[PDB]
Amino acid sequence: XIMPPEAEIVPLPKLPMGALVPTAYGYIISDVPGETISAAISVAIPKDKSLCGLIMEYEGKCSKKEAEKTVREMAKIGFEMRGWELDRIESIAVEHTVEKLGCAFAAAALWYK
Amino acid sequence: XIMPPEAEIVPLPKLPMGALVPTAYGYIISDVPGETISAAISVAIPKDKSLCGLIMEYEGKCSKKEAEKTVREMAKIGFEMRGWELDRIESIAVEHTVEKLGCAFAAAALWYK
Amino acid sequence: XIMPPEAEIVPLPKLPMGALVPTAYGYIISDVPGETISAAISVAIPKDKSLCGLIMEYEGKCSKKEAEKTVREMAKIGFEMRGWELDRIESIAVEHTVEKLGCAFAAAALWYK
Amino acid sequence: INPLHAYFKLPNTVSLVAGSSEGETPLNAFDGALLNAGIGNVNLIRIS
Amino acid sequence: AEINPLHAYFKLPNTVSLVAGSSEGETPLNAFDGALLNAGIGNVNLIRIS
Amino acid sequence: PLHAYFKLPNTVSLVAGSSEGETPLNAFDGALLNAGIGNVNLIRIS
Numbered sequence: 001x002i003m004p005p006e007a008e009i010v011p012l013p014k015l016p017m018g019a020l021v022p023t024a025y026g027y028i029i030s031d032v033p034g035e036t037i038s039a040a041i042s043v044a045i046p047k048d049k050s051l052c053g054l055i056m057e058y059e060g061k062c063s064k065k066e067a068e069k070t071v072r073e074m075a076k077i078g079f080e081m082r083g084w085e086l087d088r089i090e091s092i093a094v095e096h097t098v099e100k101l102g103c104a105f106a107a108a109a110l111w112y113k
Numbered sequence: 114x115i116m117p118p119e120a121e122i123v124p125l126p127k128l129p130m131g132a133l134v135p136t137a138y139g140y141i142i143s144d145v146p147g148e149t150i151s152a153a154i155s156v157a158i159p160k161d162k163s164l165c166g167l168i169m170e171y172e173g174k175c176s177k178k179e180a181e182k183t184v185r186e187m188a189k190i191g192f193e194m195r196g197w198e199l200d201r202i203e204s205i206a207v208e209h210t211v212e213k214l215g216c217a218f219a220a221a222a223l224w225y226k
Numbered sequence: 227x228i229m230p231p232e233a234e235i236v237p238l239p240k241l242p243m244g245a246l247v248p249t250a251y252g253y254i255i256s257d258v259p260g261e262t263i264s265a266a267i268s269v270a271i272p273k274d275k276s277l278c279g280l281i282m283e284y285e286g287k288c289s290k291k292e293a294e295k296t297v298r299e300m301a302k303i304g305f306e307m308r309g310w311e312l313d314r315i316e317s318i319a320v321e322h323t324v325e326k327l328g329c330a331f332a333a334a335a336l337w338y339k
Numbered sequence: 340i341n342p343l344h345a346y347f348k349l350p351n352t353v354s355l356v357a358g359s360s361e362g363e364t365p366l367n368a369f370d371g372a373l374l375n376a377g378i379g380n381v382n383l384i385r386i387s
Numbered sequence: 388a389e390i391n392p393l394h395a396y397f398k399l400p401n402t403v404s405l406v407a408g409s410s411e412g413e414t415p416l417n418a419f420d421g422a423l424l425n426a427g428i429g430n431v432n433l434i435r436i437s
Numbered sequence: 438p439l440h441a442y443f444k445l446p447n448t449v450s451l452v453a454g455s456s457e458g459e460t461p462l463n464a465f466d467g468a469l470l471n472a473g474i475g476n477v478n479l480i481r482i483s
C-alpha cells in the first residue's frame with residue numbers, strides 16, 4: 001502493498017547502509033539452464049488523493065512483457081474490488097535467462113523524503 | 114506473536130491508510146472448488162500482568178470450529194511451555210468455501226492507543 | 227541481511243518482552259522421526275568499518291558442521307561479489323534430531339546499545 | 340503527564356481480525372481477504 | 388527505553404547478536420516457538436529482514 | 438525538527454534487477470545489488 005496517501009513515486013533515494021526499508025517485492029529463482037524467469041511490480045494510483053495507492057507483485061517463468069502485463073491487471077482488479085476511481089498504473093519489470101542458477105527481482109521501496 | 118505486557122485487546126482502531134502495522138497472521142489459498150478452508154488467530158493473556166500475551170495462528174482445510182479449537186489449544190500449549198498462569202484465551206476464526214479461487218485469513222494487529 | 231556500518235557483535239542483551247526486533251534467520255521444521263535438521267547463520271565483517279556487514283542464513287537436512295560450513299561460504303561469496311575486503315566471519319549453527327516434530331533455528335538479531 | 344512520541348515506542352493494543360474472499364489470482368484473493376477483514380488498506384509487517 | 392524500528396527509521400540498530408536453538412513441539416508453530424525460547428529470543432516480536 | 442514527528446512513508450521507488458549466483462541466497466543478494474538496493478535491510482510488506 002500500500003502506497004500511503006499523498007506519497008510520491010520518486011527515483012530511488014540515497015539510502016543509509018543497513019537501513020530497515022519497508023519494501024513490497026516479488027522474486028523468483030531457478031536452477032534450470034535456459035529457463036526465462038521474470039518479476040514485476042505495479043502501483044495503482046487513485047484519482048482521489050485522500051485514498052491510498054495499491055502495490056502488486058508478480059513473478060513467474062515467463063517473459064518481461066507478460067509479467068508486466070499480468071501485474072498491471074492485478075492492480076486494476078484491486079481498485080475494482082475497492083470500487084475506487086483509478087488514475088493510472090506505474091510499473092517496472094525484469095527478466096532473466098538462467099545460465100546455471102538465477103534470480104529475477106522487482107520491488108517498490110517505501111522511504112522518507 | 115507476542116502481545117507486549119500491559120497491552121490491551123481492543124476493537125480495530127481507525128488505522129491511517131498505508132501504516133506499517135506489525136501483524137501476526139495465518140492465511141490459506143485454495144483453487145479447489147467446493148473445498149472448505151479456514152484460518153484462526155488466538156491470544157493467550159497471562160494472569161500476571163507484568164508478563165506478555167502469546168499470539169498463535171492457524172490455517173488449514175477444516176471448518177471454522179476445528180480451526181478455532183486448534184489455535185486456542187496452541188496458545189495454551191505455549192503458556193504450558195513457559196509455565197505461565199492463564200487469565201483467558203481470546204480468538205476468532207473464519208472459513209471459506211472455494212468457488213474458483215479463495216483465501217481465508219486471520220490476524221492480530223499491533224497498534225497504538 | 228545487512229549489519230549496519232560500525233555495529234558490534236555482542237552476546238544477546240536482555241530484550242524487553244514484546245520488543246520489535248529486526249532479525250535475519252533460518253529455520254527448518256520436520257516431522258520425520260530420526261531425521262537430523264540444522265540451521266546456521268553467518269555475519270561477514272568488513273575490514274573497512276564504514277562498510278556494512280553481510281548476514282547469511284541456511285537450513286537443511288544435514289549436520290551442524292555442514293550447515294555452518296555452507297553458511298560461511300555464502301557470506302564469503304557475498305563479499306567477493308561486492309569486491310570488498312573481508313575481515314572475518316562470525317557464525318553459529320544448531321542441529322536437531324527429530325523425535326516426532328522438531329524445529330532447528332539460527333538467527334542474527336539487530337538491536338541497540 | 341500525557342506521553343509524547345508514543346508512536347516511536349512499542350505498540351500497546353492488539354486487534355483480532357479475520358476475513359475471506361474469492362479472487363482472480365492468489366494475491367488478489369489475499370487482498371480481498373484483508374479487505375474483508377478490515378485491514379486491506381494498511382501495510383502488514385509480518386511478525387513471528 | 389522502547390523503540391519501534393519501523394517508525395524510528397532514522398535510528399539504525401548498532402548491535403548484532405547470533406543465537407540458535409532447537410525444539411520439539413505438538414505443532415509446527417509450537418516447535419518453532421520452543422526453538423525461539425531455547426535460543427533465548429522467545430518472548431519478542433521478530434521482524435524478519437531480507 | 439527539535440521534536441521528531443511520526444510519519445508514514447512518503448516516497449515509493451520502483452527498482453528491478455536480476456543475477457546469477459552460486460546458491461539461491463547469493464543469487465537473490467546479487468539481484469538486489471543489480472537493482473541498487475543490495476546494501477539495506479528489506480522489511481517485506483504484505
Ligand SMILES: N=C(N)NCCCCN
Nearest residue numbers: 114137168169387420431
Ligand atoms: N512466539 C513467537 N515469537 N513466535 C511463534 C508464533 C509466530 C506466529 N504468530
Ligand SMILES: N=C(N)NCCCCN
Nearest residue numbers: 001055370379381382483
Ligand atoms: N492490501 C495489503 N496490505 N496487502 C495485500 C496485497 C499485497 C501485495 N504485495
Ligand SMILES: N=C(N)NCCCCN
Nearest residue numbers: 227250437466469475477
Ligand atoms: N542484501 C540483502 N539485503 N539481502 C540478501 C541476503 C539476504 C539474507 N537474509
